[PDB]
Structures are given as structure tokens and as C-alpha cells.
Design a protein around this ligand. Structure first.
Ligand SMILES: Cc1cn([C@H]2C[C@H](OP(=O)(O)O)[C@@H](COP(=O)(O)O)O2)c(=O)[nH]c1=O
Ligand SMILES: [Ca+2]
Length: 129
């Protein structure tokens, strides 16, 4: 896979961010994770985690997988990186997202993220507490 440039427009919630990609605004939905909705327990925490991460980064980057690049809502499906650190992985390692929506053909980082989730569950963090 390859990392491509993007510029943060707004953090939206734990697993969606709006960003400028190839010069057009795009809402990105993080591959392979599911944060709680803002109205649910750990929703506000997930939202603040991802917001801090992307807003504090000197750059963000998006990396598409091998399969679908857009979902049925028009959202970009990507792994997002904040100064080289993957947001998707970080959320799962902190117990603020579950590994989810793992579709054949769009699951390059599945094992990386399942390992993180095992660690968060072992440490009883957030969702897992
Ligand atoms: C993460 C992801 C979500 N989606 C779709 C499936 C779900 O459809 P449904 O809306 O019909 O439930 C929805 C979940 O996103 P949210 O968790 O942002 O609600 O997004 C994909 O199609 N591919 C993906 O890789
Ligand atoms: Ca969600």
C-alpha cells in the first residue's frame, strides 16, 4: 500500500475525519474499526482521541487498501496516519474502537489491528473495562 497526502479539514468523530484529498474535500471513514457513536459510552472519548491526533499532527496521510475506496455513502475508506502513526491502530490499542467491518479484499492491516485489540483487552482499557 501507499501513503498519499491529505490536509485536515475537520475531525468529525472517533472514526471519521473530513480532509482535502487531491484538492477536493472528502469524508474519510477509518478502515477496519468501529468507534462508539458520540451518543454512546466512550463515544466522546473516541471523538476526542482522534481529534487530538489529527489536529496536532504536522501532516496527515491516507492509505487506501486494495479493494473498495469509497463506501455506499461516498466516504473514502482508508488507513489514516498522523505524522506516520496510524490512527486506526491507535484507537484499537487504546480500547476506543473495536476491530470491525473486516471485508475480504480490503483487510491488509487486519492482523496488526487484532494484535492491538488483544493488548487493549488484556489491559482492560476503555471499552474493555
Ligand atoms: C468501515 C466501513 C463501513 N462501511 C459501511 C457499512 C455500514 O453500512 P450501514 O450504515 O448500512 O450499517 C456503515 C458503518 O459505518 P459507521 O460505523 O460510520 O456507521 O458503513 C463499509 O461499507 N465499508 C467499510 O469498510
Ligand atoms: Ca462508528
Amino acid at each position: 500500500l501507499h501513503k498519499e497526502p491529505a490536509t485536515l479539514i475537520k475531525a468529525i468523530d472517533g472514526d471519521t475525519v473530513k480532509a482535502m484529498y487531491k484538492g477536493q474535500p472528502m469524508t474519510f471513514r477509518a478502515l477496519l474499526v468501529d468507534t462508539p457513536e458520540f451518543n454512546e459510552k466512550y463515544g466522546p472519548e473516541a471523538s476526542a482521541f482522534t481529534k487530538k491526533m489529527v489536529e496536532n499532527a504536522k501532516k496527515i496521510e491516507v492509505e487506501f487498501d486494495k479493494g473498495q475506496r469509497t463506501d455506499k455513502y461516498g466516504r473514502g475508506l482508508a488507513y489514516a496516519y498522523a505524522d506516520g502513526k496510524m490512527v486506526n491502530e491507535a484507537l484499537v490499542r487504546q480500547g476506543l474502537a473495536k476491530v470491525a467491518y473486516v471485508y475480504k479484499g480490503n483487510n491488509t492491516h487486519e492482523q496488526l489491528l487484532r494484535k492491538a485489540e488483544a493488548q487493549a483487552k488484556k489491559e482492560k482499557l476503555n471499552i474493555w473495562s
